[PDB]
Every structure is written in structure tokens, then in C-alpha cells.
A paper describes a structure:
We have recently turned our attention to a new class of controller proteins (exemplified by C.Csp231I) that have quite novel features, including a much larger DNA-binding site with an 18 bp (∼60 Å) spacer between the two palindromic DNA-binding sequences and a very different recognition sequence from the canonical GACT/AGTC. The overall structure of the complex consists of a C-protein dimer bound to a DNA duplex.
The C.Csp231I–21-mer DNA duplex complexes crystallized in three crystal forms. For the OL complexes (space groups P61 and C2), the resolutions obtained were 2.30 and 2.75 Å, respectively, while the OR (P61) crystal form diffracted to a resolution of 1.80 Å. The structures of the two OL DNA–protein complexes that crystallized in space group C2 (two complexes per asymmetric unit) are very similar to the P61 OL structure. We note here that the intermolecular interactions observed between the two complexes in the asymmetric unit of the C2 crystal form may be of biological significance (this is further elaborated in §4.4). In addition, Lys40 of subunit A is in proximity to Glu83 of subunit F, and these two residues may also interact. There are also potential contacts between a protein subunit of one dimer and the DNA bound to the second dimer; for example, the interaction of Lys87 (subunit B) with a phosphate of the DNA (strand H). We note that three of these interacting residues (Glu83, Lys87 and Asn90) are located in helix 7 at the C-terminus of the protein. A U-bend model is proposed for this tetrameric complex, based on the results of gel-mobility assays, hydrodynamic analysis and the observation of key contacts at the interface between dimers in the crystal.
Author numbering:
A (entry chain A), B (entry chain B): 1 to 94
Write the structure that this text describes.
Amino acid sequence: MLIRRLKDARLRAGISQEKLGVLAGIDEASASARMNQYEKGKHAPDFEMANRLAKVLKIPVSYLYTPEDDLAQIILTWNELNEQERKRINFYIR
Amino acid sequence: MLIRRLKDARLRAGISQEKLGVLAGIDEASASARMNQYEKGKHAPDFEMANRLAKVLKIPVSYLYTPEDDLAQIILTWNELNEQERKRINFYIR
DNA sequence: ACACTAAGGAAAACTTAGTAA
DNA sequence: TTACTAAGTTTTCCTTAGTGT
């Protein structure tokens, strides 16, 4: 998991490391420590948790694993497109 | 990491679980076991190994971590674009 | 060649109990 | 409050050594 994507998504959201964990379902006791470990690259969360974090952060989970700056932006933006906007890009791909 | 995504990518590369591990840097002696365990979802590779696996499979590492089928395709398809075709999309998104 | 699995040491994540701006 | 960390504990993985096609 890319620590910097985790930091940018959390900052845009406006919540602490501890808050993020609790909402993401991590136990109050270890929430603060764990969320800091992931954000400092000391440990990696597992994919389940990653999804849970993504859900709180209102981003697609794969943004967290996207190194390509240009692609990460596309994902972040695809996420917010409305019904027509996406239907446009779909015909585009196929 | 989504095992189904790993499997589909490998099959399109037209290579064995083993060869994949070998080319991805896993030692010959364990490459088969490991790559199978990943593909059956017994254990998940760490991100570094994911990245290695992706370079060999000629795909963006996000693909392995994207549960949405329509976003996965977008990622896969963006991958096939040239430097200019990508400037064309990056401006649409800025 | 190719897909696959149990077991147990190797290694990584999780928990606790904190400190530091 | 929020960020951060070491050390202990528990969990998951990598390697070995086989299975079967």
C-alpha cells in the first residue's frame, strides 16, 4: 500500500489517523497505533482493511495502490463522475 | 489482492504460475508453490511482490487491487495508450 | 510441465503502554 | 489532541517436501 496516497486521502477527508481507524472498524484500543503504522509505512494493512478504509475515505480502494500519479488522478475522478459521464468513458473503452 | 485479477492477467500473458514467479524474481525452488498460493488466495503477496508480478504481466499494479469490473477495464485499457493519448486524457481530467 | 497442498520455522502484523509536539 | 514508537504477542507467510494431472 502507498503511504502517501493514504495520507492525501485522509487529509482531504479532514480526519485524524485515530478517527479513520475507528470508523474503519478497528478497535478503539489499537486504532491510533495501527493507523499510524500504516501511514508511516511501518506495517501494511491487509486488503480487507484497505477496503474498509477506502469506504470511509470515499475513494476507490485501488487508488491506495496506484503509483502512477496521472492514473491515480483518473481513478479519483472516475469515482465522482455521474451516470452520463461514465457511460461516455465506457463506450470509449469498448 | 484480487486472485481473480491475478489469474486473468496471467492467463492473458499465456504463462504458467511457475514461470510467472521465476520471471518475477521468486527462486525456482519455491516459485510454483508461492504463485499457486497467491492464485488460490491462501496467502497474499506483499506490495513489492505485487509490483514485480505486474511488471512481468505488462499491467498497472492497481489492476490487481481493483474490485470494480468497469474501473479494472479502464485501468487495463489506459495501459495500452501512448504518451500523447495519455496527454489527451490528463487534460480532460484537469 | 502444470496445478496444487500441509507443516513449521521465518517474518510480518497486531496489541500495549506509553512519549513528544 | 494528534502523531508517533518500542517491545511483547499473535497471525500470516515462505520454504520445504511432497500430492496428482
